[PDB]
Amino acid sequence: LKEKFNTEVTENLMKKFNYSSVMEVPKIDKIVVNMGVGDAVQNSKVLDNAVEELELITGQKPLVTKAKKSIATFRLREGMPIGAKVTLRGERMYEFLDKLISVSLPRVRDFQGVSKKAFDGRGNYTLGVKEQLIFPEIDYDKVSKVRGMDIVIVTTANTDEEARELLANFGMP
Amino acid sequence: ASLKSIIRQGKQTRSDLKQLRKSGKVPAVVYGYGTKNVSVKVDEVEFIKVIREVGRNGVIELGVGSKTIKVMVADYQFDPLKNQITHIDFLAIN
Amino acid sequence: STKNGRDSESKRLGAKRADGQFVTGGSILYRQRGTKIYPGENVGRGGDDTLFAKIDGVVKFERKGRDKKQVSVYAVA
Amino acid sequence: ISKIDKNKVRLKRHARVRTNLSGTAEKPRLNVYRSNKHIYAQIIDDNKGVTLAQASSKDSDIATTATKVELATKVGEAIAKKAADKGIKEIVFDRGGYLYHGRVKALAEAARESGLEF
Amino acid sequence: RVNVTLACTECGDRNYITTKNKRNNPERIEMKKYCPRLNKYTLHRET
Amino acid sequence: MLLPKRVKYRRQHRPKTTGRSKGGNYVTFGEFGLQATTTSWITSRQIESARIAMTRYMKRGGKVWIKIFPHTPYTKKPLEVRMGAGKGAVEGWIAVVKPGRILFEVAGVSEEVAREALRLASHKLPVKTKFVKREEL
Amino acid sequence: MKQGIHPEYHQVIFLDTTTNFKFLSGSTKTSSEMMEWEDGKEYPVIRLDISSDSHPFYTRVERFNKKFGL
RNA sequence: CUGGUGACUAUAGCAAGGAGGUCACACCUGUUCCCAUGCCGAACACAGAAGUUAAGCUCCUUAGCGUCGAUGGUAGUCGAACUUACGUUCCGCUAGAGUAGAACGUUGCCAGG
RNA sequence: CUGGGGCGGUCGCCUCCUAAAAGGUAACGGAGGCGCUCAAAGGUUCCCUCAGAAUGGUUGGAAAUCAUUCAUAGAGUGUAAA
RNA sequence: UAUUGGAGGUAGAGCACUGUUUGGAUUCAGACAAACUCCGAAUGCCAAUUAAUUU
């Protein structure tokens, strides 16, 4: 669990990268749950329901993002709230990782997981979702529109490879 | 690499710099490390020959006054419409 | 005919007093738009960017930073 | 990820407050500075730039074990008396770049009852 | 966008003159301003 | 046939013609060039006469560089009209050559073909010209 | 965490068949089927699953011959 | 010497490289209390002192990038005198660019060592 | 009013260039605006900081929202320009 | 008139920004501008003198 994260340092990280200080070890800093669009023409009840998903997959009222660009040729402009986001940092940010690494394993229908090359050169997975693996308390009876989340697990790593070794615990790459 | 020159006095009026260019003379300065700035007047026809196959960037033993400091043409200043050199900078090399 | 006969009866902007000159308490020192020049000591800024003295003294234009400047007024005895 | 320095973020919140800084030698400014276990008062005259009276938390007279907020109130009492001996009675308080809360309302409420006017 | 007159609520009547947009403020406006007959801040209704 | 595809003001004042050229005084792309020893406006219809003329003579030897671009428009009033009811409409595009400027460039041919191809060119131009090689020393 | 803003949570009953790692949480609220004292896995919904047991990664010619004899 | 706080047109800055630590400064440990995040104790505030010099911070060499910069010479010009030329001549003032070069900061008050 | 008169265009106000580094300076010279708007888009006390470019990400309109990094100033400033 | 201090971006010149452009492989060279400026005069202008001369 969380204490296993302490044993993960000297597990391989303390010996693989050969860091001369315990403070120079990777760590998970935060996670984001950016949902999507919820087209703000007929989706005043879509985001009202999608907000219930991220609020159900994690215990926190996510802040609704307001589109800040006046994109013409589209139903968007300065204003018009068309997005939702929720941040998880503390011990709760560790639960939402174990509950995914231990519940989103078989309920993915994908052999290689989500991707093998997801390190953006800055230590951030930003994986996908199918709305069924995550939200295990959100059964397949409540809503209809199945959407794909976006979990960007920003870590304190300093290189693409270190995120691979650091994310080895409870990961299928 | 043998070009002997003359020292010109201070505060050259506008006319008498125009009188010596009418001859085969060209103003010039000598700066670098090893000797301070000097207002010098070298000759035209002797400068072209000395620079003829010494190269665009070669060493010229310029005898300033009574000394002889090896120098190099730093930059030149040209009149394309009259085909004349009007001023030359000599960089003293150590 | 044309489309181009217009203009405005514009403004006598600029410096109204000089550096080293003596001025009274409500004198206008500089008439601008924006701040080409900025208020220093004992001068204030009006509602349309006017710079005016606040005390009897002598005017001084000085440098403020890289490429700014201010005015001032001192209180010579 | 990148970390933000908490000193530079307040050293810029302070230059913007000292655009009404006036230690005029008849009404100087009372400075403050927090490190982590260290409240540092000071009183300066800005027309000349010289310190008139300094009292910190690391001095031997204020070397004790307290909450650092019950201890900060003993740092405003110290400098409040040294300011009394210098014939100064009215100051203008700049909060550094910090919020006036906790440590500093204690350092100011402790200095504002010791006679210093502000 | 109209013109409005602010009349005192106890000192009796007109003190100030302002403007308003009657599509954004369709009601009667309310503001505390200085009545100089009472020498005191009071409440002013639009006439 | 040359002109800028855009312009922010098409009614402009006219250029000053006294002084000496600032830029384009040496040959820097070819081996030979055509220098101007007189002041004038080159009008963008007489840059095509002179390009075609020296191009046809060389017969696909090297290439040419037109070192002048007609950047400024000029206006003209409609034939027989009285004086002063606004400014006239654009009538052509000009450059301004002062004594010193290099107008054309050639390379990849011989001096005996270069002196002759740039001689047909200068008879299509209203300036007094001169032949030059690349400066050195 | 503010008071009233965040949703209601609790240590979820993650005592599924895959080792019963009930160290999670969630807004899942239902009858407490199995409430153990070793780890809090009492209330919400979860008593078994095939998630951490058989993961997706960590879980013609023949027809012809079969039909005939070849 | 370290720190707090002002003054100076970056000669003071970016950049890369390397040292440093309980008198300090920081990461760091936590959310009961003061207060707090249009969601998150991340930030802000507070209560703390196990762990570290890795990072920030400070110190030390580097002239790659910026900033600074002559002298000499030119453009352009005030005045004069010739002239009607896309001008000449004389005198004074004199750029911009570009070179040689300067430079990896000077300095006041306070408190400690 | 007016390169005779007439047609067309013009009349009051604001910004720029012409305008010759103070200020002022004409033409039927060259370019644009105004005849309002805002109960906060005003006062004050705290806090905050940009457009864009890559990268990796269900949507993809190449271009919504999300995250990291380089961004000095290329955003924003109700409404023309300075 | 001499000295001293100021405000102000013109000539020239430069591409650092807004536009306009030629040839090579976002760069390496070359050009253009009343309404372009990283720069920037000579003069004129506003003042001080505890300076001379004349009205």
Residues of chain B with C-beta less than 8 angstroms from the C-beta of F137: 48, 51-52, 56
Identify the CA nearest to E4 among candidates E28, E38, E24, E34.
E28
Q: Looking at beta carbons, which pairs linking A19-28 to residues 24 or more positions away fall under 8 Å?
A: A26/A123, A26/A155, A26/A156, A26/A157, A26/A158, A26/A162, A26/A163, A26/A165, A26/A166, A27/A155, A27/A156, A27/A166, A28/A93, A28/A94, A28/A97, A28/A153, A28/A154, A28/A155, A28/A156
The answer to whether position F5 is within a domain reads no
Q: From CA G24, how far away is CA F135, in angstroms rounded? A: 83
Q: Following DSSP, what letter does each residue of G2-67 receive, concatenated?
A: -SSSSPP--B--B--TTTT----B-S---------SSS---SSSBS--STTTS-SS---HHHHHHH
- Tokens 């693996």 belong to A133
Q: From CA C37, how far away is CA C68, in angstroms rounded? A: 7
F81 contacts chain C (CB < 8 A):
no
Range 69-128 of A in CB contact (< 8 A) with D:
123
Per-residue CA distances from F130 to F38, F95, F127, F136 (Å): 10, 19, 10, 18
Q: How many CA atoms lie within 13 A of D72 on its CB side?
A: 22
β-strands D29-31, D92-93 pairing: parallel
Nucleotides of I under 7 A from a protein CB: 3-4, 8-11, 13-18, 22-25, 27-33, 36-40, 46-48, 51-52, 55-59, 61, 63-70, 82
Residues of chain D with C-beta less than 8 angstroms from the C-beta of A155: 1
The first and second tokens of residue G36, run together, are 């153990």
A20: closest CA of chain G, how far (Å): 33
Q: From CA F125, how far away is CA F103, in angstroms rounded? A: 10
A28: closest CA of chain D, how far (Å): 10
The first and second tokens of residue A159, run together, are 């290189």
Q: From CA D82, how far away is CA D69, in angstroms rounded? A: 21
β-strands D29-31, B69-79 pairing: unpaired
Please identify, in words, the CATH class of the domain defined by D20-109.
alpha beta
- Are G6 and A98 contacting, i.e. CB atoms less than 8 angstroms apart? no
Residues of chain D with C-beta less than 8 angstroms from the C-beta of A123: 1
Sketch out chain A's domains with CATH numbers.
2-166 (3.30.1440.10)
The first and second tokens of residue B24, run together, are 């085969």
Characterise B52 by phi-psi region: left (phi > 0), alpha (psi -120 to 50), beta (else): alpha
CA B34 to chain centre: 17
The answer to whether position F10 is within a domain reads no
Q: From CA C49, how far away is CA C31, in angstroms rounded? A: 7
Q: Following DSSP, what letter does each residue of A96-164 receive, concatenated?
A: HHHHHHTTTTTTT--TT-S-S----SSSB--B---SSSS-TTS-TTS--------EE-BBS-SSHHHHH
Does G27 contact A59 at a Cβ distance shorter than 8 Å? yes
Q: Following DSSP, what letter does each residue of B33-85 receive, concatenated?
A: SSS--EEEEEEHHHHHHHTTTT-TT--EEEE-TT--EEEEEEEEEEETTTTEE
Residues 23-62 of C with CB under 7 A from strand J: 36-37, 61-62
- Are D88 and D80 contacting, i.e. CB atoms less than 8 angstroms apart? no
The helix (H) or strand (E) run that includes residue D51 is strand D50-56
- Are A105 and A134 contacting, i.e. CB atoms less than 8 angstroms apart? no
- Identify the burial level of D40 via C-beta atoms within 10 angstroms of its C-beta, where 0-12 means exposed, 13-18 middle and 19 or more buried: middle
Q: Is the CB of C20 under 7 A from strand J?
A: yes
For nucleotide H52, the protein residue with its alpha carbon nearest to C1' is A23
Per-residue CA distances from B1 to B47, B48, B52, B87 (Å): 10, 11, 10, 19
Question: CB A126: neighbour CB atoms within 10 A?
Answer: 16
Question: CB F23: neighbour CB atoms within 10 A?
Answer: 9
The answer to whether position F132 is within a domain reads yes
The first and second tokens of residue B93, run together, are 């090399």
D103: closest CA of chain A, how far (Å): 27
Q: From CA C40, how far away is CA B22, in angstroms rounded? A: 58
- Are E19 and E2 contacting, i.e. CB atoms less than 8 angstroms apart? yes
Q: From CA G18, how far away is CA G53, in angstroms rounded? A: 5
Q: Looking at beta carbons, which pairs linking C11-19 to residues 24 or more positions away fall under 8 Å?
A: C17/C53, C17/C59, C18/C59, C19/C59, C19/C60, C19/C61
Give strand pairing partners of C1: none
- Tokens 């300011």 belong to D83
Nominal resolution (angstroms): 2.9
Q: How far is the CA of D77 from the C1' of H3 (A)?
A: 23
Q: From CA C32, how far away is CA C40, in angstroms rounded? A: 15
Per-residue buried b or exposed e for B61-77, using 16+ beta carbons within 10 Å of the residue's own CB: ebebeeeebebbbeebe
Cβ pairs bridging B and F (under 8 Å):
16
β-strands B84-92, B25-32 pairing: parallel
Beta carbons within 8 Å of G33's beta carbon, 6+ residues apart: G13, G47
F53: closest CA of chain B, how far (Å): 26
Q: From CA B20, how far away is CA A65, in angstroms rounded? A: 79
Per-residue CA distances from F68 to A139, F49, G2 (Å): 75, 14, 72
Beta carbons within 8 Å of F4's beta carbon, 6+ residues apart: F69, F71, F93
Q: From CA A130, how far away is CA A107, in angstroms rounded? A: 9
Residue ranges of the domains in chain C?
A: 13-77
Nearest residue of chain A to residue D2 (CA atoms) = A156
Helix D73-85 vs helix D103-111: crossing angle, to nearest 10? 30
End-to-end alpha-carbon separation of chain E, Å? 16
D1 contacts chain A (CB < 8 A):
yes
Q: From CA C8, how far away is CA C31, in angstroms rounded? A: 18
The first and second tokens of residue B20, run together, are 């010596």
Q: Is the CB of F45 under 7 A from strand J?
A: no
The first and second tokens of residue C40, run together, are 């220093």
A55 contacts chain D (CB < 8 A):
no
Q: Following DSSP, what letter does each residue of C18-74 receive, concatenated?
A: -TT-EE-TT-EEEE-SS-SSEE-SSEEE-TTS-EEE-SSEEE--EE-SSS-EEE-EE
**Beta-strand runs (E) in E1-47:** 2-8, 16-20, 30-35, 40-46
Q: After which residues is chain B broken (C to N over 2.5 A)?
A: none
Characterise C12 by phi-psi region: left (phi > 0), alpha (psi -120 to 50), beta (else): beta
C4: closest CA of chain F, how far (Å): 9
Nearest residue of chain C to residue F87 (CA atoms) = C2
- Are A134 and A96 contacting, i.e. CB atoms less than 8 angstroms apart? no
Mapping DSSP onto H, E and C, the string for F30-76 reads CCEEEEECCCEEECCCHHHHHHHHHHHHHCCCCEEEECCCCCEEEEE
The first and second tokens of residue C24, run together, are 């009274």
Nucleotide showing the shortest C1' distance to residue F82 CA:
I3
Nearest residue of chain A to residue D3 (CA atoms) = A156
Helix ranges restricted to H, D1-118: 8-15, 73-85, 103-111
Does A102 contact G53 at a Cβ distance shorter than 8 Å? no
Total domains in chain F come to 1
CA C6 to chain centre: 29
The helix (H) or strand (E) run that includes residue F124 is none
Residue D49, classed as helix, strand or coil, is: coil
Residue E34, classed as helix, strand or coil, is: strand
The first and second tokens of residue B15, run together, are 């006319």
Give strand pairing partners of B8: none
The first and second tokens of residue G22, run together, are 């009930």
For nucleotide H49, the protein residue with its alpha carbon nearest to C1' is D37
Nearest residue of chain C to residue F84 (CA atoms) = C1
How many residues belong to chain G?
70
Residue ranges of the domains in chain D?
A: 20-109
A162: closest CA of chain D, how far (Å): 14
Residues of chain G with C-beta less than 8 angstroms from the C-beta of A136: 26, 28, 45-46
Rg (chain F; Cα; Å): 17
Characterise A18 by phi-psi region: left (phi > 0), alpha (psi -120 to 50), beta (else): left
All partners of chain B with 3 or more CB pairs under 8 angstroms: F
How many residues belong to chain C?
77
Residue F80, classed as helix, strand or coil, is: coil
User: Starting at the edge strand that comes first in sequence, how are the strands of the sheet with D50-56 ordered?
Assistant: D50-56, D40-45, D29-31, D92-93
F83 contacts chain C (CB < 8 A):
no
F86 contacts chain C (CB < 8 A):
yes
Nucleotides of H under 7 A from a protein CB: 4-7, 9-10, 23-28, 31, 34-49, 51-57, 70-76, 86-87, 89-92, 98-101, 108-111
Q: From CA F128, how far away is CA A95, in angstroms rounded? A: 87
Q: From CA G54, how far away is CA G1, in angstroms rounded? A: 37
Q: From CA D83, how far away is CA D30, in angstroms rounded? A: 10
Q: From CA B63, how far away is CA B4, in angstroms rounded? A: 5
Q: From CA F101, how far away is CA F128, in angstroms rounded? A: 11
